[PDB]
């Protein structure tokens, strides 16, 4: 678990403030006068479930304390 | 092999379009003086706090 | 004709069978399985027989 | 049954006899710790053996480190069957070269080179190549 | 319905680098950032040429 | 030094010997059967008692990598060139600059890498081997080579 | 024997001129005039002898004269034995109706069931189809109007009965109308079953028209294309003709090889007729280069003298492939060496080579000399949308042509590892393709 969160913490998505700052810098550059695809951890239940059944996820972390536990009971079986 | 044969959308291969529209909106706001650019803001915080 | 009677999608059958395998068996279905090993009713018994056959080998 | 000897494999760089002993002495008293190295230059071969005084300490040392993700490596620790002694694992060091020789006199050493040249010239004649001088 | 400044600059660059070769403008990774078909490129470039000359 | 006639006859004899007389692609033995090598032996070691990883550059009259790249068109492995540069000098030069000042002579720099790329993206042994083994000429910055 | 000689419509002449055909060959010179008279033909012309236009032009002319509409249903039904040949016939027919107002459609195995059903719903005036799916669409789809059938054409009846569609053909004959229908049959050869089918589908008394070892390489399904690329790159100076199973795979391979700086030419049934003629004429005089084409598209064409003929994909007609290794050597006076890529699962094909008594030679390839461009190909497929789509289409077509092969004892799809097949197309994970496995 400690080694898994060292890899997953290097692909943390940008926060609202950082994304806004990055977009405003580009906007200010344009207002005066070719990038690679980003990388981040995928989240959201529906998004990850859609990724799993399309065979795109390389590794899926499932929380063990979802209060309506039926939200994630099918997930280990779907992943296997 | 996957469950469905839905084709891959073209928006997954090219840069973001929502961000392009948002950047152009910020550009339009900057040109109207509603948003002070970060360089000008950095200039204004080195001139008063004395 | 309408879509409502078209067919069953691959994903739909996949989801139904996965939920069947995960949820378990209701008590009367356990009784039916025990009885078998030792129109609604026909479908239910055919489902139980399919479950038995899939549990055996595949 | 089982022995008190555990074989450890897929060791990272810089995890040698002293490091292995220091880490595995916390699971019990040790009796022998040896690491495989290259003979020509002292360099870890990334596996080794070590024996516990208590046989039941080796089982605990094996159950907790058999799939340890360390330095990008999956340590492979396993207990050996009954008997299965560990031996012949020397702690080699880097072998420096010694420049010694020229025992033969310069006259004989210089005369042998001529006959080597002549024999070399004659050698290629039987290999479908014509070469003069 | 007139084009924008940035679109006109992009079409400027495309025309100045390739001319009327739509197949190369389609496969160019630096100017066709949003990979667009030959038909769309031809239509927009024709509009640009008609407006300019 | 060496009379020209002896070297000429040696090369002619090697050419004759190398071609005396199922498989889709030539194997290692057949691929490099015609490679030419000059063996030079002195008294005692060449570089003393210290290992030298530097290459001695001997001047040649005729280009050595031009026929290589020309004859690499009909080979499974292309002739690629790698240029390793310093961290601070990786942004001062682009592929366009080397294209402008090198295509007029026939030279193509296939890849330009930094020293930071050798410790992040090609750190793993397999990836490093796969990347490095595809180049036939590696030119390193004078400061970074050591 | 010119096209302008026969009295035809204006759109027909426009289309014929556009494709570039001026001097009709003998097969289409001694059959089209009798066909415009309305009689029945039991031909014997070989496949690719120009008979396609010979049985097409009367159909378009009849539809134009009767002035069909989409709500009239189908008027012409063409029956073909193989999935890839029906695609070629449909591609040819798309160009004879560029200016006409009729409607054309294709019904083949492995395609979308509901899409074909809806195309039938809208009303298709000329249907080109395989026997297997015709029965399903006739007996199952409601709203497929076919009572207005005016003509029926059977292509390669010998192939149809060889594959085993004779029961399907009998049921189809029992379903389709018979009175207003003037029918047509073509077969290169004729056995008892051929006239058995001809009698129950044609009017009585119809006019009839009369017209060096082989090598193989055992390769893995995840390395077939990479080894092929290595071989082609190593042998660029020679002349090589590469045969593929489908048109989509031909176009994907040609586009990929041109993208990686390896000049090749392409022929497939989804191209213009003028484009095909231009490329094939170019290939016959360039004394260098590689041409990639489908098996069926290179049947009628007279193959020139080339240094290598590679059969990358399983042959559509193995019975013809066994004979062609000697036929093309009888024709071409040069040493045209043949090669055939076989995967370990389909290695039983050699039996047919041994039983038919042809010399057999095996080729080896070192494992470490392969091109090692898999990473580049996979990076390119994930980035270029157009190349991604073309690769997926080629994968689809390859699987669809592999599933419906006549030699089920050799080319069975159940023993094909789809992950390794998609690996050769640049895909880490196989795309989903709706095939019964």
Curated annotation (Swiss-Prot), chain A:
Keywords: Cytoplasm, Ribonucleoprotein, Ribosomal protein. It comes from the Eukaryota. GO terms for molecular function: RNA binding; structural constituent of ribosome. It is found in: Cytoplasm. One of its GO terms (cellular component) is cytosol. One of its GO terms (biological process) is maturation of LSU-rRNA. Belongs to the eukaryotic ribosomal protein eL8 family. Present with 238000 molecules/cell in log phase SD medium. There are 2 genes for eL8 in yeast. Component of the ribosome, a large ribonucleoprotein complex responsible for the synthesis of proteins in the cell. The small ribosomal subunit (SSU) binds messenger RNAs (mRNAs) and translates the encoded message by selecting cognate aminoacyl-transfer RNA (tRNA) molecules. The large subunit (LSU) contains the ribosomal catalytic site termed the peptidyl transferase center (PTC), which catalyzes the formation of peptide bonds, thereby polymerizing the amino acids delivered by tRNAs into a polypeptide chain. Component of the large ribosomal subunit (LSU). Mature yeast ribosomes consist of a small (40S) and a large (60S) subunit. The 40S small subunit contains 1 molecule of ribosomal RNA (18S rRNA) and 33 different proteins (encoded by 57 genes). The large 60S subunit contains 3 rRNA molecules (25S, 5.8S and 5S rRNA) and 46 different proteins (encoded by 81 genes). This is Large ribosomal subunit protein eL8A. The gene is RPL8A. The chain holds residues 87 to 171 of 256 of the full protein.
From Swiss-Prot, chain C:
Its main location: cytoplasm. Keywords: Acetylation, Cytoplasm, Ribonucleoprotein, Ribosomal protein. It comes from the Eukaryota. GO terms for cellular component: cytosol; cytosolic large ribosomal subunit. One of its GO terms (biological process) is cytoplasmic translation. GO terms for molecular function: RNA binding; structural constituent of ribosome. It is found in: Cytoplasm. N-terminally acetylated by acetyltransferase NatA. The keyword S-adenosyl-L-methionine does not apply. Belongs to the eukaryotic ribosomal protein eL36 family. Component of the ribosome, a large ribonucleoprotein complex responsible for the synthesis of proteins in the cell. The small ribosomal subunit (SSU) binds messenger RNAs (mRNAs) and translates the encoded message by selecting cognate aminoacyl-transfer RNA (tRNA) molecules. The large subunit (LSU) contains the ribosomal catalytic site termed the peptidyl transferase center (PTC), which catalyzes the formation of peptide bonds, thereby polymerizing the amino acids delivered by tRNAs into a polypeptide chain. Present with 31600 molecules/cell in log phase SD medium. There are 2 genes for eL36 in yeast. This is Large ribosomal subunit protein eL36A. It comes from Saccharomyces cerevisiae (strain ATCC 204508 / S288c) (Baker's yeast). The chain holds residues 26 to 100 of 100 of the full protein.
Swiss-Prot record, chain F:
Present with 45900 molecules/cell in log phase SD medium. Interacts with CDC4, PRE4, PRE6, RPT1 and SCL1 as part of the fully assembled 26S proteasome. Interacts with pre-ribosomal particles constituent NOP7. It is found in: Nucleus, Nucleolus. It comes from the Eukaryota. The gene is CIC1. An adapter protein that specifically links the 26S proteasome to its substrate CDC4 which is one of the substrate recognition subunits of the SCF E3 ubiquitin ligase complex. Required for turnover of cell cycle regulatory proteins CDC4 and GRR1. Required for synthesis and nuclear export of 60S ribosomal subunits. Required for vegetative growth. This is Proteasome-interacting protein CIC1.
Curated annotation (Swiss-Prot), chain G:
The keyword Electron transport does not apply. Changing residue 51 to A: Lethal in vivo and impairs ATPase with 2-5% of wild-type ATPase activity, a 20-fold higher KM for ATP and prevents RNA/DNA heteroduplexes unwinding activity in vitro. Pfam families: CTE_SPB4, DEAD, Helicase_C. One of its GO terms (molecular function) is ATP-dependent activity, acting on RNA. A motif (DEAD box) lies at residues 155-158. It is an enzyme of class 3 (hydrolase). Phosphorylated by CDK1. Its EC number is 3.6.4.13. It catalyses: ATP + H2O = ADP + phosphate + H(+). Keywords: ATP-binding, Helicase, Hydrolase, Nucleotide-binding, Nucleus, Phosphoprotein, Ribosome biogenesis, RNA-binding, rRNA processing. Its main location: nucleus. It is found in: Nucleus, Nucleolus. Signal peptide: none annotated. ATP binds at residues 45-52. GO terms for cellular component: 90S preribosome; nuclear envelope; nucleolus; preribosome, large subunit precursor; small-subunit processome. Changing residue 324 to A: Lethal in vivo and leads to less than 30% of wild-type ATPase activity and a 2-fold lower KM for ATP in vitro. A motif (Bipartite nuclear localization signal) lies at residues 223-239. Optimum pH is 6.5. Active from pH 5 to 8. Residues 212-381 form the Helicase C-terminal domain. Interacts with RRP1. Associates in the nucleolus with the 60S and pre-60S ribosomal subunits. It has also been isolated with the nuclear pore complex. The Q motif is unique to and characteristic of the DEAD box family of RNA helicases and controls ATP binding and hydrolysis. Transcription depends partially on SET1. PANTHER family: RNA HELICASE. This is ATP-dependent RNA helicase HAS1. It comes from Saccharomyces cerevisiae (strain ATCC 204508 / S288c) (Baker's yeast).
